[PDB]
Amino acid sequence: PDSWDKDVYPEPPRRTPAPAPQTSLPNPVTYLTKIFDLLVDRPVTLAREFIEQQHAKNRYYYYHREFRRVPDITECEEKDILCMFEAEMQWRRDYKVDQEIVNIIQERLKACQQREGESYRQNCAKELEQFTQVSKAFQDRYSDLGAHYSARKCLAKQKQRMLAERKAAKEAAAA
Amino acid sequence: IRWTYARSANIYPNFRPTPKTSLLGALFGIGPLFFWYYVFKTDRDKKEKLIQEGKLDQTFNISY
Amino acid sequence: MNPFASLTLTTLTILTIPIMMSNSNIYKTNLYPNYVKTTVSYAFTLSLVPLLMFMHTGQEMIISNWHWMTLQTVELSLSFKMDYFSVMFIPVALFVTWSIMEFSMWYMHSDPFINRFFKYLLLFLITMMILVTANNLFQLFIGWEGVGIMSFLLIGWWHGRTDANTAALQAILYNRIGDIGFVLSMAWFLTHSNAWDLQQIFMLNNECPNMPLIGLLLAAAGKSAQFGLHPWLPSAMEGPTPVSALLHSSTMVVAGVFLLIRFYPLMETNKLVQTMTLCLGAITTLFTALCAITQNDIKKIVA
Amino acid sequence: HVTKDMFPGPYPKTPEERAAAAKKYNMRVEDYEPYPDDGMGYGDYPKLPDRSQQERDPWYDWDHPDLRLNWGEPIHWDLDMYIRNRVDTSPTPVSWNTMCKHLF
Amino acid sequence: NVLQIVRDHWVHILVPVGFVFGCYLDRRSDEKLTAFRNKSLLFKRELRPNEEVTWK
Amino acid sequence: TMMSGRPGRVPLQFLPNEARSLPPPKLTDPRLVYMGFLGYCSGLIDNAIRRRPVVSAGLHRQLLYVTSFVFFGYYLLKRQDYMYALRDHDMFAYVKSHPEDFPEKDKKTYGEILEEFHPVR
Amino acid sequence: MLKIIIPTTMLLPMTWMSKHNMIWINATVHSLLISLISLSLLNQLGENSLNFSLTFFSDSLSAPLLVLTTWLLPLMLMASQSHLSKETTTRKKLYITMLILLQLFLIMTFTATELILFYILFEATLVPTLIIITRWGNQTERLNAGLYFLFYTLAGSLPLLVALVYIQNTTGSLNFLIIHYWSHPLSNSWSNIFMWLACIMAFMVKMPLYGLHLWLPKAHVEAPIAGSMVLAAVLLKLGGYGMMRITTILNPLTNYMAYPFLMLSMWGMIMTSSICLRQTDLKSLIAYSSVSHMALVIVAIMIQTPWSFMGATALMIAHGLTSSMLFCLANTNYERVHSRTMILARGLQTLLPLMATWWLVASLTNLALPPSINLIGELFIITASFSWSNITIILMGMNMMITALYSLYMLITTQRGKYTHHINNIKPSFTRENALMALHILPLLLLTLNPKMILGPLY
Amino acid sequence: GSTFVAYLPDYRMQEWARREAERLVKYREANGLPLMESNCFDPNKIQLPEDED
Amino acid sequence: KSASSLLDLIWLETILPKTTSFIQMKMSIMVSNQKGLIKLYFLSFLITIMISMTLFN
Ligand SMILES: CCCCCCCCCCCCCCCCCC(=O)OC[C@H](COP(=O)([O-])OCC(O)COP(=O)([O-])OC[C@@H](COC(=O)CCCCCCCCCCCCCCCCC)OC(=O)CCCCCCCCCCCCCCCCC)OC(=O)CCCCCCCCCCCCCCCCC
Ligand SMILES: CCCCCCCCCCCCCCCCC[C@@H](O)O[C@H](CO[C@H](O)CCCCCCCCCCCCCCC)COP(=O)(O)OCC[N+](C)(C)C
Ligand SMILES: CCCCCCCCCCCCCCCCC[C@@H](O)O[C@H](CO[C@H](O)CCCCCCCCCCCCCCC)COP(=O)(O)OCC[N+](C)(C)C
Numbered sequence A: 001p002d003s004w005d006k007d008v009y010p011e012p013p014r015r016t017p018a019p020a021p022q023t024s025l026p027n028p029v030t031y032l033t034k035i036f037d038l039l040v041d042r043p044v045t046l047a048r049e050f051i052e053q054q055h056a057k058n059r060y061y062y063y064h065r066e067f068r069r070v071p072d073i074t075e076c077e078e079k080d081i082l083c084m085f086e087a088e089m090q091w092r093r094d095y096k097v098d099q100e101i102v103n104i105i106q107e108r109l110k111a112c113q114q115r116e117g118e119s120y121r122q123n124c125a126k127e128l129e130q131f132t133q134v135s136k137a138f139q140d141r142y143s144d145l146g147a148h149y150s151a152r153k154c155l156a157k158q159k160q161r162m163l164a165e166r167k168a169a170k171e172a173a174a175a
Numbered sequence B: 001i002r003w004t005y006a007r008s009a010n011i012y013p014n015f016r017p018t019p020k021t022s023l024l025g026a027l028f029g030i031g032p033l034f035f036w037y038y039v040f041k042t043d044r045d046k047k048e049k050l051i052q053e054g055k056l057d058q059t060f061n062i063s064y
Numbered sequence C: 001m002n003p004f005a006s007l008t009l010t011t012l013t014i015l016t017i018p019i020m021m022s023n024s025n026i027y028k029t030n031l032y033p034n035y036v037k038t039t040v041s042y043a044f045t046l047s048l049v050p051l052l053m054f055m056h057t058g059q060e061m062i063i064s065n066w067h068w069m070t071l072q073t074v075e076l077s078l079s080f081k082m083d084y085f086s087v088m089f090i091p092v093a094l095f096v097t098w099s100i101m102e103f104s105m106w107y108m109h110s111d112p113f114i115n116r117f118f119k120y121l122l123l124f125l126i127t128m129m130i131l132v133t134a135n136n137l138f139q140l141f142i143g144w145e146g147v148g149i150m151s152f153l154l155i156g157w158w159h160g161r162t163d164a165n166t167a168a169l170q171a172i173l174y175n176r177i178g179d180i181g182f183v184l185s186m187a188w189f190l191t192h193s194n195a196w197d198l199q200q201i202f203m204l205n206n207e208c209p210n211m212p213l214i215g216l217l218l219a220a221a222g223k224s225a226q227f228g229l230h231p232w233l234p235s236a237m238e239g240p241t242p243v244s245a246l247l248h249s250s251t252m253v254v255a256g257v258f259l260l261i262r263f264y265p266l267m268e269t270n271k272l273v274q275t276m277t278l279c280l281g282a283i284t285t286l287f288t289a290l291c292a293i294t295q296n297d298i299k300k301i302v303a
Numbered sequence D: 001h002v003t004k005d006m007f008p009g010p011y012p013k014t015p016e017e018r019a020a021a022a023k024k025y026n027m028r029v030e031d032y033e034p035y036p037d038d039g040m041g042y043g044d045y046p047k048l049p050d051r052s053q054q055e056r057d058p059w060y061d062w063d064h065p066d067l068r069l070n071w072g073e074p075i076h077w078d079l080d081m082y083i084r085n086r087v088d089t090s091p092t093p094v095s096w097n098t099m100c101k102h103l104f
Numbered sequence E: 001n002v003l004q005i006v007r008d009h010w011v012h013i014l015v016p017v018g019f020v021f022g023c024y025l026d027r028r029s030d031e032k033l034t035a036f037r038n039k040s041l042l043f044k045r046e047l048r049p050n051e052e053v054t055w056k
Numbered sequence F: 001t002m003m004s005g006r007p008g009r010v011p012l013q014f015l016p017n018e019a020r021s022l023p024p025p026k027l028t029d030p031r032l033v034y035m036g037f038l039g040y041c042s043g044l045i046d047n048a049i050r051r052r053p054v055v056s057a058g059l060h061r062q063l064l065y066v067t068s069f070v071f072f073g074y075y076l077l078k079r080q081d082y083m084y085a086l087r088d089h090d091m092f093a094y095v096k097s098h099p100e101d102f103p104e105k106d107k108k109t110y111g112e113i114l115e116e117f118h119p120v121r
Numbered sequence G: 001m002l003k004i005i006i007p008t009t010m011l012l013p014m015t016w017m018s019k020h021n022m023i024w025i026n027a028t029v030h031s032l033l034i035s036l037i038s039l040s041l042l043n044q045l046g047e048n049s050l051n052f053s054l055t056f057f058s059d060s061l062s063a064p065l066l067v068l069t070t071w072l073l074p075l076m077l078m079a080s081q082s083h084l085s086k087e088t089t090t091r092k093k094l095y096i097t098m099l100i101l102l103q104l105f106l107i108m109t110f111t112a113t114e115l116i117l118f119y120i121l122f123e124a125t126l127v128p129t130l131i132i133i134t135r136w137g138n139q140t141e142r143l144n145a146g147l148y149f150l151f152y153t154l155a156g157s158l159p160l161l162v163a164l165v166y167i168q169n170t171t172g173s174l175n176f177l178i179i180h181y182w183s184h185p186l187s188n189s190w191s192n193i194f195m196w197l198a199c200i201m202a203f204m205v206k207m208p209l210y211g212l213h214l215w216l217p218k219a220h221v222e223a224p225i226a227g228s229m230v231l232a233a234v235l236l237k238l239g240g241y242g243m244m245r246i247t248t249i250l251n252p253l254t255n256y257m258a259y260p261f262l263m264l265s266m267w268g269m270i271m272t273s274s275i276c277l278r279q280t281d282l283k284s285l286i287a288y289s290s291v292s293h294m295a296l297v298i299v300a301i302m303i304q305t306p307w308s309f310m311g312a313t314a315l316m317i318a319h320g321l322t323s324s325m326l327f328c329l330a331n332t333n334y335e336r337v338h339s340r341t342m343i344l345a346r347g348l349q350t351l352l353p354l355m356a357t358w359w360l361v362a363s364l365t366n367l368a369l370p371p372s373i374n375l376i377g378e379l380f381i382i383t384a385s386f387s388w389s390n391i392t393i394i395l396m397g398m399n400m401m402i403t404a405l406y407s408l409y410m411l412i413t414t415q416r417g418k419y420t421h422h423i424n425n426i427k428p429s430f431t432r433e434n435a436l437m438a439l440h441i442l443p444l445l446l447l448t449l450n451p452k453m454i455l456g457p458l459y
Numbered sequence H: 001g002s003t004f005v006a007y008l009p010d011y012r013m014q015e016w017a018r019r020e021a022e023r024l025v026k027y028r029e030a031n032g033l034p035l036m037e038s039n040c041f042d043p044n045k046i047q048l049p050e051d052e053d
Numbered sequence I: 001k002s003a004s005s006l007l008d009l010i011w012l013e014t015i016l017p018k019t020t021s022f023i024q025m026k027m028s029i030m031v032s033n034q035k036g037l038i039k040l041y042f043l044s045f046l047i048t049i050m051i052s053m054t055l056f057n
């Protein structure tokens, strides 16, 4: 379906076997789905065509909102409230986008687990690794801010982590 | 009416500070609080120490 | 396209129409039980088709149709699981329930509130079908609580009897004792696996720790009336015989066991919890049979 | 319609007020026994036997057959604990200690 | 009957009048907070050919 | 701020001449409306105390109450605004005349300031 | 925001000028219309807030509370219209005036862009409630209850004011936006400890905390039906709103100072749930249930996590609706019985089946049956507490068990069994009472369809 | 009121966030970037205080 | 016994409200119980004047 892009939500080529009736008995499944088609699928399809023509008679569009980039909290003065407000709003928008990214990855993981069936442990290692990476990044960004989280607290946590990383790297280099 | 009044409204005017009552009130009103405080404090110090040493394996722990 | 989903949702959907019509005029006539029985029989003969498709092909599905609230990275949606377990258990439950209402037609012939009795039976069936087909832990909890509340209402059917109310409260007490472990398992799974969906829970737990499995085992012991929390099942025989035949013998009381069946990928990776489950089952079956072999009430012996 | 004197009071220390309290609660002076005078505020309320309401006679014509209570008779301090839906003290065929030992 | 039911039903007009007056007063308070109209870095915009203010 | 000894203050002047350089409060000022409302409430209480129909006993008396309240409120608002203007003028003049006690802080960005982080656990 | 305040103010002139037999109809109609108007505030943003002006602002924490406050007034009028039948027109208009003043004060309190204005309105809500309790009350103890309900509150609230002004001397602004954007950590000092206590105990006393819950049973029992409704539904949520608004500046000192209150709430929920089991009064039992639920809300707020705040908001809304319904049902029983004792009138399901259904639904929604929003809030708070510490689950599960026990005990004692023989004045339930129950219960089952509407700003 | 609340416009920016995440993931996957970065801010514009201890 | 009567009805009542009521009643009785003899009040005023002269300088 064109409603969503295949690249963000990838799917395998979905190969399926062909029917190989080894006996002459008529299986009830084929006849059952034929009568199901005749009794359900055709009226639903016809109603959909009627509704789609009615929608085509009146066509209108909506646009995805675009947002400009604004200086973040790192380029804001200590007591300047306007730039702090702009940076806080931008940080909240980025936080929401990151949450949606993690949601997309989790959707991929769930779909892979359901699709691959009994061999989910092996055939979905790539999705598990992707989710591990994205979850590690998300946790590093926003694990312990808690309620009343803010851009300043996130920046302080990042500064603490980078100070620790710099100290560890300096110790390892001079070890 | 006598039953309800004696159950609800006649308790305090007949109350007397007694070693039995003082000890029982202190126990049942203070002991559980300090017990649960000690339990939760010990658990949280253990968890904080494990986090500081980094040996807790908090992978996939995103919602809190 | 792919009638498996349409049929497997249509069965549960048409199971709910008499509840909608309970406010109509037919609820005030004596044809309401026949209406409910016919609806259940049609639901069973309609659910016989997904079973045939599964037996032919082995076809399994997940239907996440409606999107509920999304909480940061956790997404909650109305998702139904149609694996082997659901598509096999639904026809059997519908067949048993059809037989039970046909029997209750004659057994409850002199009860003034027979339409209400049939409505209660249908509501219990709907809640159990919700429990069986649930794909996430919140929907499973919804079914878990619906079946318990319906059991409470049906045990105390004769509310003028003190013992019926006592038995209903006993059942509620024991089921809440199990609810403690159920909620513990839910909280642990959300905190560590970051989801309540079955797929993500199975994926992120290669070697499941003790605590969530112990919570699941406690919930299963509470609902299935194991040795620690057994007496509520014997005491539930205060309700009408159709209630004892449908809920407390064949459909509701297996629910806890079904729960442990649903989490079997995590069950096999833990040895201590398996030993606890085996020991609890053995002691429960021994004690209950030993109590049974000397009872005088027939309903108690069957329970 | 209830007067001030028909409400519970403090612990009775002399036989005169004991008789007055026994008259207040519709019982004989010999049958009257207040709770021991300790800090807990029982005041002057009859310490009826701790027997439950399940083992009251189920064939007597009580004014409240479900609760097995009469209209004007005194009510046990822990009546809500003994309502045939809760803890009952009915004697059992085997002694309590024997059942405890066997179960343990 | 007009001029008779009014003496009894005139109280029903108070709340809607209060509502419309409150909307007018909300616009009143809004008109005094335009010091940054079309000036935020996020929504810096060039005016339309027949536009004077972005929002009122 | 004790302005009793402020230099060049006429002793018993309610409104000095310099106060005329400030914008007068509008006749629709919410504070004037509240003063009129207070006058109306006083009229209603006067009607209630004397055992008269509260809403429609004296229209002239209530309207006089409202008018007097509005008059006094207008003049009080004028004086209040003048006093606040004087306070701000004095504060700004003192800040200007004493630069050494009000130094210009060095402007620093949050990217170069180390703030301790306290995790919520 | 004045589009809501001005109609509420115009409700007063309308009531006074209203005909002697048309006060209730006009009040109910216009209150429902004002609730419909206030429904528009639910449309919130993922951004900061709905800043209407310098004085009033809206938020997705304030919006559900404002909607509930506007919705409660018609229900309060419908409940109060019964027992005020033999009452003079002037005093009935005074009662409606007290209700309108309380609603106006609550509406202005929930916006309150500045903390001193919030305190002023938060303490102004006290006077109408005290007047209602001490004037239109039945028992002789009402006066005492009023005294309690007053002084407890002030005993917590007077230090807060001092702290508030002190903050304005140090920070320079008590505006919530500036306070949030310019928040700085609190050093672990004795002075900061006492400022924390002054800021916290004012809201902890009104929840109420387990130690400071004495005033609540008295105030709820001796108040009339409208007073009980407003106390249980909205007035208890002021402390939670204040705590969620004020805990921003209390960090990181909250981590150390939360322990005594966390222990007190976690044990007092069990204590009050057990107290509910042995209770000979319906109103007292409902009051203690309210205490337990608000103790859970206190635990949620002290944990200070996003899931904690979401569950707290949902639980406050659900508990308000549920407690109002329970008090209404108890008052409907009392108006027929005039005894207010559980064991006196029994077997009411035989005589009043639809009211028995209402009782069952109220008990089920108080029992936290999924997927009700009560269960959503309880589960969110439980999960947040488990993340805080894995041992809390024992106390939480015990609380759930005892809650179910006492809820079904309340239902069974009054509805099931055999009817009392000597009681013969049990008339069929009126349309007004049934409509009150339906208007109480339908919003809950509609809100469970859209939970995000009541999950707060951290959703 | 129920119908009005049900059809409230998406001011919470749920679909907007979903579409932004879709396009952002589409960009990063094609460019080979490692999805979400660990640092919320660019370290180049953060000036650490040198210890020299 | 413990939850309802011992703590809720007795000790929690004894600690905050009842102690405050008793202390305030005692202090009010002590302060207000003046027989109206100006001799005692004048002697107290003299003592206060002496204390102020010998303590606040
Ligand atoms: C946030 C601010 C916003 C809200 C503002 C709130 C305050 C505003 C008003 C302030 C005071 C001014 C008016 C009060 C005068 C008192 C007169 C009175 O008693 O009422 C009787 C009178 C009707 O009775 P009547 O036929 O004359 O003869 C009966 C006798 O008067 C007397 O009959 P009776 O003696 O036989 O009855 C005995 C009764 C009579 O005793 C009383 O009623 C005394 C009146 C209350 C005391 C007032 C104290 C001063 C104000 C303090 C406000 C406190 C606010 C802070 C919140 C805490 C609340 C305490 O006393 C008792 O029953 C004893 C127990 C009472 C319960 C305990 C006491 C609690 C009272 C506290 C009330 C506080 C709010 C008052 C609201 C207004 C009430 C009228 O009521 C009225 O008609 C006047 C009401 C206002 C007139 C509205 C006209 C405007 C409509 C057209 C213009 C449209 C405007 C918009 C323009 C654009 C449209 C196109
Ligand atoms: C309880 C509410 C207040 C009510 C007050 C009574 C209202 C009726 C009074 C009628 C008018 C009185 C004004 C007098 C006319 C001229 C006054 C003028 O000559 O005096 C000047 C000063 O004017 C008066 O002081 C102002 C009086 C106005 C009082 C209103 C303030 C009320 C406080 C806020 C509550 C709001 C009340 C609003 C409703 C009334 C010069 O003072 P100055 O010789 O240089 O120094 C002496 C004062 N010092 C020492 C403190 C510096
Ligand atoms: C009654 C119903 C409930 C009502 C509300 C009750 C809740 C209020 C209780 C307030 C919490 C405790 C207050 C102070 C807690 C601080 C932590 C302290 O307990 O720990 C030690 C504190 O040591 C000792 O506790 C010293 C204080 C001892 C004096 C307090 C009296 C103890 C019992 C009195 C209880 C009465 C409270 C109610 C009064 C009306 C740590 O030693 P230290 O590292 O050095 O100090 C750290 C703090 N610094 C950095 C600011 C210096």
Ligand SMILES: CCCCCCCCCCCCCCCCC[C@@H](O)O[C@H](CO[C@H](O)CCCCCCCCCCCCCCC)COP(=O)(O)OCC[N+](C)(C)C
Pocket: C019, C020, C021, C022, C023, G035, G039, G064, G067, G068, G071, G317, G443, G446, G447, G449, G450, H001, H002, H003, H005, H006, H007, H008
């Ligand atoms: C008597 C027996 C029954 C007979 C009747 C049979 C019919 C049964 C049907 C009734 C229940 C069955 C479930 C069917 C639900 C379908 C409707 C549902 O999908 O709509 C919900 C809508 O419900 C509302 O969202 C919730 C109700 C609003 C709550 C406000 C309460 C009303 C105000 C009153 C005052 C408030 C007091 C409390 C203060 C907070 C969720 O919609 P959503 O998936 O999201 O998106 C809507 C479409 N979009 C995408 C275009 C936006």
Ligand SMILES: CCCCCCCC/C=C\CCCCCCCC(=O)O[C@H](COC(=O)CCCCCCC/C=C/CCCCCCCC)COP(=O)(O)OCCN
Pocket: G152, G155, G156, G159, G162, G163, G166, G190, G191, G192, G194, G195, G196, G197, G198, G199, G201, G202, G205, G212
């Ligand atoms: C329901 C009843 C609850 C009662 C609530 C009472 C708890 C609140 C704490 C007591 C009142 C303190 C109010 C202080 C207001 C905040 C101001 C502040 O914190 O500033 C401090 C001031 O701190 C204080 O002075 C507090 C001293 C306390 C005096 C009053 C004692 C009252 C009783 C104390 C014992 C009770 C403690 C726990 C009470 C819990 C309630 C049960 C800094 O002072 P500076 O001189 O400016 O610092 C300069 C050097 N850095």
